[PDB]
Amino acid sequence: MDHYLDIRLRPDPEFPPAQLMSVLFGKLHQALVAQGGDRIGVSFPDLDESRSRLGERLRIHASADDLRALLARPWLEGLRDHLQFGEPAVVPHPTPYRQVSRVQAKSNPERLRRRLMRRHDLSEEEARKRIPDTVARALDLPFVTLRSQSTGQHFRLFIRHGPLQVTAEEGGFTCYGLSKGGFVPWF
RNA sequence: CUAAGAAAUUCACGGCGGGCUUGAUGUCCGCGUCUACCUGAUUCACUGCCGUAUAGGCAG
Numbered sequence: 001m002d003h004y005l006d007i008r009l010r011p012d013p014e015f016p017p018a019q020l021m022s023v024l025f026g027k028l029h030q031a032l033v034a035q036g037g038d039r040i041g042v043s044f045p046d047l048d049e050s051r052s053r054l055g056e057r058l059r060i061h062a063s064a065d066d067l068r069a070l071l072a073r074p075w076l077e078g079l080r081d082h083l084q085f086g087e088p089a090v091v092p093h094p095t096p097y098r099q100v101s102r103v104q105a106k107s108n109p110e111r112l113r114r115r116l117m118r119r120h121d122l123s124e125e126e127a128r129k130r131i132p133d134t135v136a137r138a139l140d141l142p143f144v145t146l147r148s149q150s151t152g153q154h155f156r157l158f159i160r161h162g163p164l165q166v167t168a169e170e171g172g173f174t175c176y177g178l179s180k181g182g183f184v185p186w187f
Numbered sequence: 188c189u190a191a192g193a194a195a196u197u198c199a200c201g202g203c204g205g206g207c208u209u210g211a212u213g214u215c216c217g218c219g220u221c222u223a224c225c226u227g228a229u230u231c232a233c234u235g236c237c238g239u240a241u242a243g244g245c246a247g
Binding site for chain 2: 016018019021103104106107132136138143146155156157158
């Protein structure tokens with residue numbers, strides 16, 4: 001956790017950086033699924049909260065063995081033309097800590113209507129009256145649009161950075177690099 | 188401080204009966220429309236699960 005690897009987005013004359021970010025995030029998700037482990041933290045060094053911008057720089061946080069296992073994986077092939085890869089340097093000691101969390105939303109009422117059909121055996125009009133169409137959740141959070149190998153539907157994954165703390169305790173990490181209770185340093 | 192200031196047009200009404208517009212007609216010769224383009228920007232806010240929950244989380 002003491003080390004970090006920094007990825008900068010090369011500007012692209014054919015693609016805006018958002019879909020490049022989505023592609024690389026899917027590649028690192030596949031790399032972490034293949035590699036395993038629960039000590040991989042993500043960071044957005046230039047996250048703009050004014051317009052919910054993802055940013056043009058990426059920071060991944062891991063240990064030395066985890067970082068060399070990640071860079072040894074051949075997922076990096078086919079993406080070197082658009083990114084920078086620095087060195088697994090030690091993170092600065094006086095750094096505030098913040099958490100990253102995947103915030104999902106119930107933006108589609110018909111999914112929950114189908115769910116309550118499978119839970120309470122209600123009819124179509126019962127679910128229509130019980131759940132209006134205005135219950136959609138709109139999030140002013142940065143997001144990435146990806147499709148999964150298990151389910152081919154394209155899903156949107158919101159990423160939100162927590163408040164700055166002064167210390168961090170041990171926690172877990174998901175397959176996306178998002179923390180289920182962990183923290184990443186800010187610098 | 189205005190060619191300032193003021194004001195009831197209104198009651199009633201049968202327009203109609205009749206009619207052959209028809210004869211004839213050459214539109215027409217000629218014609219280089221070209222050249223050059225990322226539709227796509229996160230544009231699939233989607234599928235399922237824990238929960239009575241629309242309250243609120245979780246899975247790829």
